[PDB]
């Protein structure tokens with residue numbers, strides 16, 4: 001760890017601290033996630049073991065790269081690719097002017113490519129929020145912070161309950177579902193999509209029940225037709241107020257018909273019907289950006 | 299060949315290929331104990347059996363046991379000249395890493411120290427987990443023997459909905475097949491066969507080649523060698539009878555088949571070598 005010179009502290013969590021660092025020889029800048037092992041009662045934290053093993057196997061242009069794992073002294077250093085900006089700060093900087101639609105489309109396309117890659121490797125991110133989406137100077141945006149991620153089996157079993165930051169948390173999580181998988185990440189990305197368009201959090205709740213009701217007030221209170229099994233879920237109550245779904249013209253005014261269609265499908269109540277990341281890439285909203293590949297009907 | 303149905307969330311052949319490609323990144327050496335001339339194969343069987351008992355006591359998932367088994371076998375293949383008194387430390391540290399990867403609320407470090415009857419301190423376990431994870435190049439996400447059996451049981455019990463992610467199959471036949479695999483993993487010669495082949499050959503013994511091919515994708519020729527090897531193990535299980543699904547205090551019944559169990563399998567392992 002002699003060739004790296006710490007430049008600035010950029011982050012801090014329960015695991016440890018994140019620094020920006022500069023290679024003294026090559027001039028290369030990286031991000032160091034430092035874990036102090038003398039302070040840890042259970043050895044390498046479960047979240048670091050998971051994140052390291054997952055990222056060793058998740059190399060993709062829209063996923064922040066894990067470059068190296070260095071054990072030195074009583075310390076474990078995770079060395080990452082460094083990006084100078086996150087989407088949350090970019091949205092706030094763009095709040096008065098707005099993000100141009102082609103950049104919103106390009107960013108969403110890229111996030112869906114990174115997510116489609118995670119999901120085909122059977123990995124749930126489970127903490128997609130603008131503060132975890134990193135941006136470089138060349139127009140790329142990348143998924144970061146896999147500390148809450150989890151590989152899922154085929155089939156899944158019951159995993160850690162009450163995941164995802166509250167504003168980006170899917171309604172099936174809030175109502176206490178036993179099983180979940182890739183749909184929770186799509187919901188978060190849908191919230192983020194709307195947030196890029198309107199420059200305001202779509203559902204900024206301050207408690208689980210307030211988050212749920214903010215969802216109900218915008219998408220309508222779900223029932224058995226739109227979401228089979230919703231009335232049998234642990235936290236569902238027949239006493240919930242009945243609100244009517246709002247016209248997306250009023251929810252995301254700037255967005256055209258294609259965007260409204262894609263957003264609706266990413267915010268479908270039923271996790272079984274909510275659009276997949278792979279399918280979303282094929283949506284007409286991106287028909288200008290992408291060209292499909294010939295499919296072998298064999 | 300691929301047995302997955304069409305997947306709403308990804309290209310079925312993509313998901314399968316990645317699963318298959320992974321099993322080529324994770325190497326196994328059925329003869330790795332020749333790197334450690336002071337060890338014998340029975341020692342590995344005794345160690346693995348002990349880890350199985352440990353898992354049941356703490357209600358650890360079968361997946362957790364098989365990760366520990368996989369970390370131990372791959373780690374040993376990177377080392378040389380290990381002595382028998384070091385085995386308990388490598389095993390329990392393998393299980394420590396595995397539990398931290400897999401369980402929602404893993405047991406604490408001192409509990410892993412506790413079950414060694416003081417032959418392994420917490421400090422030694424922390425040293426050993428770093429040695430293992432570094433020697434494994436932090437490649438800690440294998441497809442376990444039991445994970446394959448999980449995939450096979452879903453596909454066998456698929457409806458017209460082709461929903462592959464929400465579990466749906468009889469718990470009691472799952473545990474019966476897992477019992478054959480738990481016996482088989484005690485013998486180091488099992489590593490000759492890919493983990494997915496091992497699991498499919500166990501399933502065949504409890505059903506048929508048609509069902510096996512339908513849920514695993516492999517043709518009878520792929521598994522014939524494995525099935526022939528598993529033959530004595532399967533009969534030793536058949537002579538003694540099929541085990542019963544256990545309930546576990548604090549485990550929901552729809553997860554009860556996923557908890558690791560233990561029985562006198564070292565006795566049964568002897569008969570299979572006849």
Ligand SMILES: C[C@@H](NC(=O)O[C@@H]1CC[C@H](c2cc(NC(=O)C3CCCCC3)n[nH]2)C1)C1CC1
Pocket residue numbers: 010011012018031032033064080081082083084085086089131132133134144145146147
């Ligand atoms: C704290 C961090 N935690 C984490 O796990 O991030 C991974 C490990 C560190 C890796 C990383 C971070 C990074 N640049 C930034 O943070 C900039 C700093 C200046 C302001 C904008 C953001 N480049 N590379 C990714 C979460 C993701 C942001």
